[PDB]
Design a protein around this ligand. Structure first.
Ligand SMILES: CC(C)[C@H](Nc1ncnc2[nH]c(-c3ccc4c(c3)C(C)(C)C(=O)N4)cc12)c1ccc2c(c1)S(=O)(=O)CCC2
Length: 169
C-alpha cells in the first residue's frame, strides 16, 4: 500500500502528528517523500540526519557529497531532492535555521515552504532539538505554511504531548 501512515492524530486538514522515530516510520510506510533536517553541506553527522543516513548504510552521505561537489552548498531555508534509498522514493533535504548558531528564525517559513512542492511528506519538526528553535513555534509555522499533506513524526512523548496540548488550546 502507498503512504500507509498509521496512528497519527489529525491536527488540521493537511497536518498530522505522531510520537514516533522518523526512521522507523520511513521503513514501515516507505512514503513517496521523507524530509531530512539537513545542514547546508549535507553532512549527516548526528541527530535526525545521522539516523536517516545510518539507515541507508551511508548511501545517502555518498550521494550527498556528489551533489555538493557538482552544485555547491544549499542556502539556509532551501532544499534539494535526492534519492530516498530504502526509506522512501525521494528524500527532500531541507535546511531550517540553526538558532543556536545565530541563524534567523524567520527562515523557518522559507524552510517549510519547500514542502509545498510535494503532495505527501513524512517529516521531522524543523529546527527543533539542537537547532534551538522553540518547538511549539515550529509547529505553528508548519501549520500556517504547509498546504500539501504532511505527517510529522516527533520522537519524544513528552514533546508530542506538549505540542498537541498547545495546538488544541
Ligand atoms: C525534537 C526531537 C525529539 C526530534 N527528534 C527526532 N524526531 C523524529 N525522529 C527522530 N529519530 C531520531 C533518532 C536519533 C538517533 C537514533 C535514532 C533515531 C535511532 C533510534 C534509530 C538510533 O539508534 N539512533 C531522533 C528524532 C528532532 C527534530 C528536529 C531536529 C532535531 C531533532 S535534531 O536532530 O536535534 C537537529 C535537527 C532538527
Amino acid at each position: 500500500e502507498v503512504n500507509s501512515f498509521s496512528g497519527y492524530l489529525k491536527l488540521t486538514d493537511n497536518v498530522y502528528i505522531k510520537n514516533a522515530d522518523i526512521v522507523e516510520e520511513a521503513k514501515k510506510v516507505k512514503p513517496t517523500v521523507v524530509v531530512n533536517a539537513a545542514n547546508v553541506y549535507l553532512k549527516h553527522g548526528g541527530g535526525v540526519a545521522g539516523a536517516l543516513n545510518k539507515a541507508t548504510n551511508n548511501a545517502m552521505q555518498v550521494e550527498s557529497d556528489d551533489y555538493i561537489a557538482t552544485n555547491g552548498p544549499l542556502k539556509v531555508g532551501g532544499s534539494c531532492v535526492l534519492s530516498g534509498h530504502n526509506l522512501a522514493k525521494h528524500c527532500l533535504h531541507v535546511v531550517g535555521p540553526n538558532v543556536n548558531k545565530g541563524e534567523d528564525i524567520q527562515l523557518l517559513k522559507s524552510a517549510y515552504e519547500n514542502f509545498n512542492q510535494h503532495e505527501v511528506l513524512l517529516a521531522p519538526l524543523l529546527s527543533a532539538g539542537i537547532f534551538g528553535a522553540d518547538p511549539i513555534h515550529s509547529l505553528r509555522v508548519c501549520v500556517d505554511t504547509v498546504r500539501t499533506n504532511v505527517y510529522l513524526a516527533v520522537f519524544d512523548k513528552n514533546l508530542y504531548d506538549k505540542l498537541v496540548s498547545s495546538f488544541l488550546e
